[PDB]
Symmetry: D2
Subunit: 111 residues, 4 copies
């Protein structure tokens, strides 16, 4: 499977479990949803890509982090966190982690 | 003006100049553009809000960093960088910096 | 500006980290010599961390005493303190070293 | 899973930083004390950085020799090297310290 994401809560140093994440493909107009899943107990979704071959182009994962903090009775600057990325080789592995705090985050292409 | 953004290029330790940044307002499960501007020689847009009172709700600034890198013949993982945030109080200041590399970034509410 | 500014933004509150002790040291042979110590102000800033002596080129270290900052709030942190080592290759320039801070994560960089 | 792992991701390439020297030191009574040194593999990893000797609680630091890493590519960096200090309260636990590296900025955290 060509896409994995995970969330590490930088305030606890522990994974953010049970966080909804969506995957969309950029279309000519707007976006098209490909999948949705929730991070597991290790804050991971190891296989977020649906059962379909990928094409080169732009994609967007959206980590629903607002809800995750809301459940802890915590406020956050971000209602959710979209990350847009480009696939240029269709059978490569893509890894998009999120390092999360209430009022800041980091994301990168992981190994 | 209630919204400032700036971009620091972590690969040079210098500001990212002449980068286009849009501002959108959330409305009916879609987004509406309110303004667009370019970071100055210091990587800043001091006054990104249009000349109209802000309303509470969710907003999205989109840093056009894919284009910034492509002009330098540098590949980037991200075609652009959207950041969504809540504006709960219409008259206070919102500062949304971006720390930028080709394959990673950080954003946060600034002071 | 002063040759050296530092500030701390608490990423968990989205507000500056006030009253955090920060030291400045110069590399001296295989060790370090303290040049100054100061505390972030109410905006999380130390606008002028260099003491009133001429800065020389070479390597330096700021240590953000963040373990203590979190301990006062009865919060645990992975880092007892956070050292950042950097170059001062040119004494005619301004050096800005921000710290973006969480209990189990941080970022630092050369700012403007 | 080892008491201590570290890895480096070069955020300018989106690829691991290979063959980077990393030391590990303990905060002993007589000063900082080297316990081990190693080099990241082709995946940017040192999965087992602890020496064979039993770990105790206390303060430790890893120093990623990134200055050298960039100098081999004829690239400048703000940091001669990057120290990261951290607490080990439970010797039975796994401690992971990734470094996300750019020439003029980095991020670190306690990983899973
Ligand atoms: Zn992962
Ligand atoms: Zn959204
Ligand atoms: Zn693309
Ligand atoms: Zn992966
Ligand atoms: Zn992979
Ligand atoms: Zn700014
Ligand atoms: Zn977009
Ligand atoms: Zn909102
Ligand atoms: Zn501001
Ligand atoms: Zn402000
Ligand atoms: Zn500052
Ligand atoms: Zn120290
Ligand atoms: Zn130097
Ligand atoms: Zn400055
Ligand atoms: Zn690792
Ligand atoms: Zn050192
Ligand atoms: Zn300790
Ligand atoms: Zn690990």
């Amino acid at each position: 499977n060509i896409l994995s994401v995970h969330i590490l809560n930088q305030q606890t140093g522990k994974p953010a479990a049970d966080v909804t994440v969506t995957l969309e493909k950029k279309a000519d107009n707007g976006w098209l949803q490909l999948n949705t899943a929730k991070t597991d107990k290790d804050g991971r979704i190891k296989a977020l890509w649906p059962e379909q071959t990928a094409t080169t182009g732009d994609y967007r994962v959206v980590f629903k982090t607002g809800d995750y903090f809301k459940k802890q009775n915590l406020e956050s600057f971000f209602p959710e966190i979209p990350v847009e990325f480009h696939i240029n080789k269709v059978n490569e592995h893509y890894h998009v982690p999120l390092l999360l705090s209430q009022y800041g985050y980091s994301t990168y292409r992981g190994s």
